[PDB]
């Protein structure tokens, strides 16, 4: 409530670390209050320039996301006391106040937070895609991407020789989300530990924590009318051909 | 440098000259360990240097890992090294750590060792072709006919305001995927014809190496086929229990029809499984609708090829011509090459290729240096396939027919379970297939079988149009060692694959990306097949591996 900068910082890390609360709360109330706030301080127009500029500062590049989740570094202290407190409190609830922990508990807490922040970053991306009127890109995304595909193939060659793009970012996050789901299913393991029960919701299509539940409970309700092509694009990728 | 097609006999004389300068063996042939075209080409060469007393030596080379090691141990007596089936796409001078002056010890520039490259893979490495005197490649005419723009851009070797975007020319050239554009055995047979050494055994080995191109480069085989039939048609000597007679007969594109049953020849064909989708149940019913429309009862089609009535076998031709194209399986009708030794049962070239592939993959049927157990198993798989090229060793050929039938059936059952469980999921630049144990034959501890299951999945799955152009990554967990076996496959061009108007995948150098990611992965077992494919990693290393793969070529 102090500074909208530190308000959305409070509400982002609240949405990330509070595993029980649904991500629909972050979309329906947190992001709306922030959009209402930039409205007042910047007028009825030319406030999207400030509303997106603030969301952009919480948008993680796919490279930043991996360095952030590698080696369980997400459980390591954050610089800002605002973000660091939400980290410690979730630790108190899931790793410290759960008795007869297994060594799987820390790993289970990170994969839960990793799959959750993927969806969280997809939300920021979908919001930025709407503010910049980029939803048209998701009609024949496979057919338009062939130009950048040629750039990537040429770049692979550039290393063994001489001897910004929010839609690609959304595609990369969806790819990363699918790898998490495929390996969590193939791991096999043929309430509970409260951190465990949350890990099981990642594959339960009844829950918002799953991809199907994230679509039906967050994406379709709150994003289908603002970014309909991207929602259909996300569906076609997660459902699969 | 390179030799044109005209200069093949000239280069052969250079090898015959330098290798016959001493009774001692100064000729070594490095064979690509696991491809039939190279296997038969060196057999033709060795027989050439054996029918004509040149002491040669055959060394199976699995990958560039084994190439660098085996070259560093070549005794200095060897003045002639032959690389068959590999090396053309890499800078051999740079890779082998060769200083051309350390070898300078009449005319041109004469070295103590000449390293010849007999390779049908493309694109040619421009250093081997235009920037090396000791590396001597046997060219297809590819250089003279296609490499004009790249030769100009390469020879801009200025070293010293104004700019030069010849770098972009060579970038597009080296971003092409690796393909095969010829048969090495067909090139060797052209050398034997120029020097008048074409016996029927050489033509059979020529047919075998060329026929082995039909599984992945069908349009290369279709291009070399008329000259093959021309040679077989030419040799018309109209006995011995060792008389070798070749004949052009219908050799249908079914899986070992004459060594199993008419039903199993269809049911286990990767071609008809792609056109009918036999992995589900609606597809198998249509195979039975096909036999019913053919007038062939199922109990007769399921009889062994021997016991089956000849009345049906003599009508199989016309029956195929009226019923197959309705189901889009016209490519089954195909004429092939058949070899008969004396008065024994005849063998097909495509059937011969199936047996050599089974022998090369499962012939014999502390993770540190556990790769050695794989190495020793692979080189003995090579020598089994090398021995199977002896006409008097019919027992080896017949066991490969059985291994091929057991191998394909296991591949079928595993892949059918993968397709019906919808395991292959789909990322932007590759398809992912994560296997757990896999209750059939060997958890794929044998790494070459995992590649064949991937090729099976690439071939027989539908997966629309936009999607089979995508590479496939396969991961198989070994719950006993808690490790994944990961392999990367680029889709190839088998016989029954429609080729018209379709385009090469925009990112055709995926094997380059897969190689780069493995080179920065903690591999507990590092396997180097020539096109960069298989590693073994811990379970928790697979997630970062697949994630990095999705970022290939981004930054």
Give a quick rundown of the structure.
The complex is a heterodimer of chains A (241) and B (555). Chain A is built from 12 helices and no strands. Chain A is mainly α and 241 residues long.
Offer a few descriptive terms.
heterodimer, A: mainly alpha, Methane Monooxygenase Hydroxylase, Chain G, domain 1, 12 helices, B: 555 residues, alpha/beta, 6-stranded parallel sheet, 6-stranded mixed sheet, globular, DNA replication regulator SLD3 (chain A), chromatin binding (chain B), DNA replication origin binding (chain B), single-stranded DNA binding (chain B)
Topology:
The complex is a heterodimer of chains A (241) and B (555).
Chain A: H1 4-17, H2 23-42, H3 48-56, H4 62-69, H5 81-96, H6 104-131, H7 141-144, H8 146-159, H9 166-186, H10 194-201, H11 211-223, H12 228-239
Chain B: E1 2-3, H1 8-19, E2 27-32, H2 36-51, E3 58-61, H3 64-72, E4 80-84, H4 92-95, E5 114-118, E6 121-122, H5 126-130, E7 135-138, H6 142-146, H7 148-154, H8 166-174, E8 179-180, H9 184-194, H10 200-211, H11 218-234, E9 244-250, H12 262-267, H13 270-276, H14 282-293, H15 298-301, H16 310-323, E10 335-341, E11 347-348, H17 349-362, H18 370-387, H19 394-420, E12 425-426, E13 431-435, H20 447-460, E14 472-478, E15 483-489, H21 510-518, E16 523-526, E17 535-538, H22 542-549
Parallel strand pairs in B: 1-7, 2-3, 2-4, 4-5, 5-7, 13-14
Antiparallel strand pairs in B: 6-8, 9-10, 10-11, 12-13, 14-15, 15-17, 16-17
Question: Please, could you describe this protein's structure?
Answer:
The complex is a heterodimer of chains A (about 240) and B (about 550). Chain A contains 12 helices and no strands. Chain A has about 240 residues and is an all-alpha fold. Chain A has a single domain, classed as Up-down Bundle (Methane Monooxygenase Hydroxylase, Chain G, domain 1), CATH 1.20.58. In chain A, helix 1 runs antiparallel to helix 2. Chain B has helices spanning about 10-20, 35-50, 65-70, 90-95, 125-130, 140-145, 150-155, 165-175, 185-195, 200-210, 220-235, 260-265, 270-275, 280-295, 300, 310-325, 350-360, 370-385, 395-420, 445-460, 510-520, 540-550, and strands at about 1-5, 25-30, 60, 80-85, 115-120, 120, 135-140, 180, 245-250, 335-340, 345-350, 425, 430-435, 470-480, 485-490, 525, 535-540. Chain B has 3 domains: about 5-235, no CATH class; about 260-330, no CATH class; about 350-555, no CATH class. Chain B contains 22 helices and 17 strands. Helices cover about 45% and strands about 15% of the residues of chain B. In chain B, helix 2 (about 35-50) runs antiparallel to helix 10, helix 10 (about 200-210) packs across helix 17 and helix 19 crosses helix 20 (about 445-460). The relative contact order of chain B is 0.09. Chain B has a 6-stranded parallel sheet. A 6-stranded mixed sheet of chain B has the order 12-13-14-15-17-16. By secondary structure, chain B is α/β, with parallel strands linked by helices. The interface between A and B is large, with 36 and 40 residues.
